[PDB]
């Protein structure tokens, strides 16, 4: 029954964005190595928004760290919302399953 | 539920309150001689008092006389 689905639905929904963070998180680590590697040897660039800002080395690492951090925090965001959306489905299942049935 | 009739109670109501009115008067007075406080709740955890109000607290006593005399003092 539809009530059971949204909770399953929003589950993998907010699950989707939470995962790709880790690959970003992974490359956030990949760039830290290079932001530890670059002294600014060749022009360092953040790009956030349709503008490409002038970026400086020293502000970039704390950024990507925050970016790493900010993303790293975002494993917890839905892992809260995971069980949230996971639970409300299960609760209605036996009901709505049997409701589907009879 | 259970009748406690005159004399045997009047012993109990006394003998406890008798016991009660002593380790307080023991302690009572400037030369009133102290009583070690005993907390059976925490080990023996102790003070040594001249105060009976502390005495009631530390070691819980059941006498109706006491419970009255508790409230009185």
């Amino acid at each position: 029954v539809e009530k059971y689905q949204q909770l399953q639905k929003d589950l993998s929904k907010s699950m989707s964005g939470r995962q790709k963070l880790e690959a970003q998180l992974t490359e956030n680590n990949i760039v830290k190595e290079e932001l530890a590697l670059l002294d600014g040897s060749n022009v360092v660039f953040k790009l956030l928004g349709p503008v490409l800002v002038k970026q400086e080395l020293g502000e970039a690492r704390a950024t990507v760290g925050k970016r790493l951090d900010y993303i790293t925090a975002e494993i917890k965001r839905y892992e809260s919302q995971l069980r949230d959306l996971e639970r409300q489905s299960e609760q209605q299942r036996e009901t709505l399953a049997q409701l589907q049935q009879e | 539920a259970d009748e406690e009739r005159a004399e045997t109670a009047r012993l109990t109501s006394f003998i406890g309150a008798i016991a009660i009115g002593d380790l307080v008067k023991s302690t009572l007075g400037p030369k009133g001689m102290d009583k070690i406080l005993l907390s059976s709740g925490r080990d023996a955890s102790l003070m040594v008092t001249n105060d009976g109000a502390t005495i009631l607290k530390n070691i819980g006593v059941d006498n109706p006389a006491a419970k009255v005399l508790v409230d009185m003092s």
Binding site: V1, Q92, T95, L96, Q98, L99, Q101, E102 | -
Partner: protein, 510 residues
């Protein structure tokens, strides 16, 4: 043993002493349990159910004994009862009595085979003069008083008081309705007790008596295609839902509505499978029933496995749970299927009676089943005491008159034979007085009075005892000449079967 070894609970004392006493106490119980008696023995079931019987197997079945001694033999009285009615209450006590003479011979120090054979020898000798003890035979199995004369005996052999109208009503039950030519049926003759009215009010409805309520309209036709079902309607609905009531609400109104026409379907398919009566080991279903009232299918709201059994038995029926539109397998047998009120209860009735498929079902009215049960005990026997399946039963004196007849005879021979064989053959003809001693008690006299006269009456094949004042002083009844007689048959068996074990049960010291 002396060692840690092997397995035995008999032998030494046990074989000689304790088995014989294990061969004693229950025979001791059966002594006034057999023959004319006022003895009564209370019993509680595994139901803890208080009941009184002078029948053994009832008592027997719930008796456990570490010995086989008491244990093994009781099959014989059953092996007996497999053959006939009572005389079974006589079977064991005959053994036990004649047995403990041997432990005396063991005190006297007589060898087993020496003790064994003289009985066996004389066991013939019994069976040899046993036909000389035929004082009559069974003329009309259709006649009531021809038969009632007998039936009174096993009932008497059970209990003294009620024997007469029983012996009447049982032939009024028409044991007549079978040839009993080798064709006789106690599946077609059933004792069905109505709890209600009196036992003198107890009737016999020829045709199946099912006190179970005849449910709704009676049979479609009297040659009833019968659907016998353990669970023909278990309900067609399942209510499990969001609430197992409603969550999406209209989904409820489907099935409670959609259930009943499936019961109609089934019931229509009872009419469609063709059953002129449907039979529910499980519950009736009201709408279904209402449909079965529309389709006028006779029904039984609830059916004992016992019901279903006889149903499955005689109909050719098969009791089945059906959540499906039903299938006739059960079909029909009985060519008239009725509703009766006896004790004023709906009686589901099935009668095909062919003299061969012939159903005469005793319907016992009575206000107590324990009443109608200890009754049915003797009634169990009388019919199958009647059931010899010799139309000519070579009627021999009832009540035990033949006993003393051969007491003189075979011990007079037991006299004539020599050796240690003597007392073997001699104790043999001494085995009779036990019951003439036993019932003499409940009669109220010593057995010497009894037996001296039972001896002094000498050869009679009449003069005998029981529970009576005739059984008291005279040591004379007519256990022939009064109408109390016995088939020649169970005699041979009551004689033989016990003689075998009494021989055999001693020989095993293990």
């Amino acid at each position: 043993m002396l060692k840690e070894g092997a397995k035995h609970f008999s032998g030494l004392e046990e074989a000689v002493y304790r088995n014989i006493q294990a061969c004693k106490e229950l025979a001791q119980t059966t002594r006034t349990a057999y023959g004319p008696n006022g003895m009564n023995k209370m019993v509680i079931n595994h139901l803890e159910k208080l009941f009184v019987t002078n029948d053994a197997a009832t008592i027997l079945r719930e008796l456990e004994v570490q010995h086989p001694a008491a244990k093994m033999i009781v099959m014989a009285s059953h092996m007996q009862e497999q053959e006939v009615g009572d005389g079974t209450n006589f079977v064991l006590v005959f053994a036990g009595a004649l047995l403990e003479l041997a432990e005396e011979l063991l005190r006297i120090g007589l060898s087993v085979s020496e003790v064994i054979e003289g009985y066996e020898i004389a066991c013939r000798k019994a069976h040899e003069i046993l036909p000389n003890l035929v004082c009559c035979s069974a003329k009309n199995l259709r006649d009531i008083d021809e038969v009632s004369s007998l039936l009174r005996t096993s009932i008497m052999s059970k209990q003294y008081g009620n024997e007469v109208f029983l012996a009447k009503l049982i032939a009024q039950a028409c044991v007549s309705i079978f040839p009993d030519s080798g064709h006789f049926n106690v599946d077609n003759i059933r004792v069905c007790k109505i709890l209600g009215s009196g036992i003198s009010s107890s009737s016999v409805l020829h045709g199946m008596v099912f006190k179970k309520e005849t449910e709704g309209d009676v049979t479609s036709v009297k040659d009833a295609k019968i659907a016998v079902y353990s669970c023909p309607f278990d309900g067609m609905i399942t209510e499990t839902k969001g609430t197992v009531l409603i969550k999406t609400a209209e989904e409820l109104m489907n099935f409670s509505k959609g259930e009943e026409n499936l019961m109609d379907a089934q019931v229509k398919a009872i009419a469609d499978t063709g059953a002129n009566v449907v039979v529910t080991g499980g519950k009736v279903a009201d709408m279904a029933l209402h449909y079965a009232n529309k389709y006028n299918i006779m029904l039984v709201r609830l059916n004992s496995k016992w019901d279903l059994r006889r149903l499955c038995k005689t109909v050719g029926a098969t009791a089945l749970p059906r959540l499906t539109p039903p299938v006739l397998e059960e079909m029909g047998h009985c060519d008239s299927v009725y509703l009766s009120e006896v004790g004023d209860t709906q009686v589901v009735v099935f009668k095909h009676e062919k003299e061969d498929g012939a159903i005469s079902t005793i319907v016992l009215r009575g206000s107590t089943d324990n009443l109608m049960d200890d009754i049915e005990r003797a009634v169990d026997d009388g019919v199958n005491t009647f059931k010899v399946l010799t139309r000519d039963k070579r009627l021999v004196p009832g009540g035990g008159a033949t006993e003393i007849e051969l007491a003189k005879q075979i011990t007079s021979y037991g006299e004539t034979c020599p050796g240690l064989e003597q007392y073997a053959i001699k104790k043999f003809a001494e085995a009779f007085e036990a019951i003439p001693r036993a019932l003499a008690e409940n009669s109220g006299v010593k057995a010497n009075e009894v037996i001296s006269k039972l001896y002094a009456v000498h050869q009679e094949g009449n003069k005998n005892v029981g529970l009576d004042i005739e059984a008291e002083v005279p040591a004379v009844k007519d256990m022939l000449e009064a109408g109390i007689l016995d088939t020649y048959l169970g005699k041979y068996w009551a004689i033989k079967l016990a003689t075998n074990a009494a021989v055999t049960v001693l020989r095993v010291d293990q």
